[PDB]
Design a protein around this ligand. Structure first.
Ligand SMILES: [Fe+3]
Ligand SMILES: [Fe+3]
Ligand SMILES: [Fe+3]
Ligand SMILES: [Fe+3]
Ligand SMILES: [Fe+3]
Ligand SMILES: [Fe+3]
Ligand SMILES: [Fe+3]
Ligand SMILES: [Fe+3]
Ligand SMILES: [Fe+3]
Ligand SMILES: [Fe+3]
Lengths: 166, 167, 167, 166, 167
C-alpha cells in the first residue's frame, strides 16, 4: 500500500478482529432490543435503548474499517456469530461492554508495543472513554434495577423503563 | 341493479353489511368501557380517554365500510347494534374484541379472494388488516405490563399504568 | 350506593339511561340517512354531509348524558340500539325525529322538576332544550324551502337546494 | 331599597347564611392547605390544591355578597367558625362540599317556593354545577387514594401528590 | 433477455402492452369529448375542463404502465391509437368507458394472479383498481344528478350542473 507507514501486520490483524467484535456487539444489542419489543415483555424504552446501543456499535465497527483503510491495511471480514428480564439484559450488556473494553485495551497494548502512537491515540480518543462511560452507565442501571427489586418485581422494571430510559 | 356495480358479488355485499354491524358493535363496547372508567368509584381517566378514542376509531371503521358499500354499488343494510371490572380485565376484553373483529375481517378477505374481487381484497388489506394487527399488538403490550405490574390485585399498578402509559 | 350521589333520584337515573339510548338511536338514524344520499342513484352529497354532522351531534348528545350520569353518581345501563326516498322526505323524517327527542327531553325535565333536582333541570335547559328548538326550526325551514321549490317531484329543486342551502 | 323587587326576606336571610357557609368552607380549605405544608406531612401539591379550593370558596362568598346587593338585600355577616392523612383530608373535603351543596339545594328550594326565578337561575348557573363537579372530582381522588393503598401507604400518597395533583 | 427481468411472464408483458394502448385510447376519447363541449354550439366549458383533465389522467395511466414495463424488464410495444350529443350522454359514454377499462384491468389482475406475480398484482391494486372504482362512482353520481335535473331534454339542467358541480 502506497500509504502504509508504521502500521504493523499484527495491528492490522487485530483491528480486523476488533471489527468483528464490534459487529458482534451490535448484533447482541439488536437481539436484546427486539426481545423487549415482544408482546409478552413489552418494555419499549428498554427496546429503544438497546437499539441505540446496537447502532452505536455498528458505527464503532465502521470507524475501525475507516481507520484500516486510512493506514493502508486491508479489511478482512468474518462471520458475525449469533448472540429474561430487564435487569438480566443490563447485566449481559455490562459484561458485553467489559469484554469489548478488554479487547480494546489489549489492542492498545499491541499498538504501544509496536510503537504506533497514531493508533494508540485513535483508540484512546474514539474508543476507550466511550467504553468507560458505557460501562459506568450500565452499572448505574444495574444498581437501580436491583435496589428497586428487579427481576422479581415487574413493577420495578416498568417504572425504571419510564423514569430512566423514557 | 346499480349502474356502477362491477365484479361485486352479492355475498361480498352481504358480508360487508355484517362487518359494518360488527364495527359499530365494537364502537359500542369501547364507549361502554370508556365511561366505566369515568365512574367515580373507578376513576382511571386515561383508561377512559383511551377507550373513548378506540370507540371513535371503530365508528370511523364502520363509516369507511359504508362508504365502500356505496362506492361498489352495494346497498347498506343496517341491523340493531347489540348492547355490550378492572383495568387489566377491560384490556383483556378489548384484546379479545379486536381478535374477534380481526377474524371476521380475515373471513371477509377470504370471501373476497374466493370471488376474485381484488379491489375489495386490497381495500381490506390497506385500511383494516394492518390496523387490527397494530391494535392487537398494542393491547397485548398493555395486558402484559399490567400483569407484570401486579394487576388486578394492585390498584397502585393500575393507577401508575394509567399515568405512565395511557397518560 | 355512590359516595358522590346527592339529590339524584332513581327515576331520573333510569330516565337518563333511556334518553342515552334515544340519542344513540337518533345518531344511527342520521347515519343511515347520510349514506343514503351518498348512493350513486341519489348522489346528493351535501344532504349526506349535513346528516352525517347531525349523526355526530346526536352521539355527542349521548356522551354528555353518560358523563352527567357519572357526575351525579348514577350507573350507566346501555341497551340495544334499534335499527332506523327523497331529500324532502328525509328532512321530514328528521323533523319528526327531533320532535320525538325533544318530547322525551321535555318529559325528562318534568320528571327532574317533580323530583326537585334543579341541577338536572338546568343541565337539560342549558345543553339540550335550546339545541332542540334550533334543530327543529332549522329542519322546518329546510322542509319549507324544498316544498316551495317543487320537491319531491322536482329533482332539479333538490339538486339546487343541496348546492345553495346545504353546500 | 329602591332596587328591591321580588326578593323575599327569607331568601335574603338564607343568602346571608350561605355567605357564612362559603366563608367557612374557605376557612376549612385554608386550614387543610397549610396542614400539608407542615414539615412532617410535606405534600406540597395537596397543599396547593386545597389553597386553590380555599380561594374558590371565598370567590363563591363574594359573588353571593354581590348578588345580595344587586337584589337590594342587606348583607349580614357572622363569625366564621374555626374549622391526618391525604386520603382523610380528601374525605373531609368531599363531605364539606356535599354539606355546601345540600345548603345550596335548600336555598334553591326556598327561591322556588318564593317564585324567584332570577335567584333560581343564578344558583343553577354559578353554584349547582360547580358543586357537582367539585364533588365528582373529590370522589375520584378518594377512590384513587384508596385503591393505591392510602392511608397506611405513604408511598401511595406521595405518588398521588405527584401524578394527580402535580 | 433483460438483466433485470425476474418473475415477469411473457403474457403479463403482452397484456401490459395491451393495457397501455387502451389507456391511450381512453385519453383520446376524453380529449375528443373535451373539445366537443368547447364548441360554440355546445359551450359547456366546465364539462370541457372536466373531460380534458380526465384525458390527462388517462395519459398518465399509460405512462405509469410504460414505466412499469421498463422496471420489470419488459419491452414496450405500441400500436395505433384508434379514433374515439349532450352533457348527460357524454357522462354516460364516460361511465361505460371507465367500466370497460376497469374490466380490462381486472382481467389483467387475474392474469397476474395466475402467474404468481405479486408485485404486478399490488401495482395494479394500488395505482389502478381503486382509481377505477372512484372514477366509476363519480361518473355515476354525475349521470344520476343530470337525469334527476331533467337532462338531456332540459338545456337549463346541463348549464346549472356545469356551474354548480363541475365549476
Ligand atoms: Fe463498541
Ligand atoms: Fe493521547
Ligand atoms: Fe374496527
Ligand atoms: Fe412516575
Ligand atoms: Fe340529541
Ligand atoms: Fe346558483
Ligand atoms: Fe362554594
Ligand atoms: Fe335555568
Ligand atoms: Fe386509466
Ligand atoms: Fe395489495
Amino acid at each position: 500500500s502506497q500509504v502504509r507507514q508504521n502500521y504493523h501486520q499484527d495491528s492490522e490483524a487485530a483491528i480486523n478482529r476488533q471489527i468483528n467484535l464490534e459487529l458482534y456487539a451490535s448484533y447482541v444489542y439488536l437481539s436484546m432490543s427486539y426481545y423487549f419489543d415482544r408482546d409478552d415483555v413489552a418494555l419499549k424504552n428498554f427496546a429503544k435503548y438497546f437499539l441505540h446501543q446496537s447502532h452505536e456499535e455498528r458505527e464503532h465497527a465502521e470507524k475501525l474499517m475507516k481507520l484500516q483503510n486510512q493506514r493502508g491495511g486491508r479489511i478482512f471480514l468474518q462471520d458475525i456469530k449469533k448472540p429474561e428480564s430487564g435487569l438480566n439484559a443490563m447485566e449481559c450488556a455490562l459484561h458485553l461492554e467489559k469484554n469489548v473494553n478488554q479487547s480494546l485495551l489489549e489492542l492498545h497494548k499491541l499498538a504501544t508495543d509496536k510503537n504506533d502512537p497514531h493508533l494508540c491515540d485513535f483508540i484512546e480518543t474514539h474508543y476507550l472513554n466511550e467504553q468507560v462511560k458505557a460501562i459506568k452507565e450500565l452499572g448505574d442501571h444495574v444498581t437501580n434495577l436491583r435496589k428497586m427489586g428487579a427481576p422479581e418485581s415487574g413493577l420495578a422494571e416498568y417504572l425504571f423503563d419510564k423514569h430512566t430510559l423514557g
